[PDB]
Amino acid sequence: SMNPPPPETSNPNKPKRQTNQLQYLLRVVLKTLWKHQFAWPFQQPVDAVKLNLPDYYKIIKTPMDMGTIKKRLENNYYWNAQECIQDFNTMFTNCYIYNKPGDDIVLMAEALEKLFLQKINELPTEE
Ligand SMILES: COc1cc(OC)c2c(=O)[nH]c(-c3cc(C)c(OCCO)c(C)c3)nc2c1
Ligand code: NA
């Protein structure tokens, strides 16, 4: 069994900027979720090999996780807040698509997503 390569976190071909919204995404949004008691399954790519989930990457063709997001923020990968917000939504959506209501991982995702929603509701106006 094999995992795919992780999503990229560096690409000199990609355009990027450092903005007040992206700073908020790191300092407020990512930090809040990262510290949460239920963050840990989401802090790195799903290891479908060790977890014995051989169909994971058959169903999830756009993997995303907060370790990748953290690196993207820290390594100034993004052009705008929407690109980052999309990554968070992909991560949550992947969990809901793969799993079933009431599963522990879904409950965990839902807790993180509640906080995500509240933080992004106060994303500052661009400077
Ligand atoms: C340890 O990190 C994870 C991260 C995950 O997603 C971010 C998942 C995930 O999306 N599903 C599961 C997973 C694993 C098993 C063995 C489960 O029991 C029944 C088989 O379907 C369930 C319901 C979910 N484990 C993750 C572990
Ligand atoms: Na993943």
Closest to 65 measured CA to CA, from 27, 93, 102, 107? 93
Whether 103 lines ligand 1, by a CB cut-off of 6 Å, is yes
Q: Which atom of ligand 1 is nearest to the CA of 109?
A: 7
6 falls within a domain: no
Distances (CA, A) of 113 to 10, 80, 93, 119, 122: 26, 20, 10, 10, 15
DSSP string, 56-82: HHHH-SS---HHHHHHHHHTT--SSHH
Among 46, 62, 104, say which to mutate for ligand 1: greatest number of ligand atoms within 8 Å of CB: 46
**The domain spanning residue 76 has which CATH number?**
1.20.920.10
CA distance 103 to 105: 5
11 falls within a domain: no
Closest to 98 measured CA to CA, from 64, 68, 71, 70? 64
58 falls within a domain: yes
Domain that holds residue 85: 19-123
The answer to whether residues 93 and 60 touch, using CB atoms and an 8 Å cutoff, is: no
Number of domains in the chain: 1
Q: What are 46's two structure tokens? A: 């799903």
104 falls within a domain: yes
111 falls within a domain: yes
78 falls within a domain: yes
115 falls within a domain: yes
14 falls within a domain: no
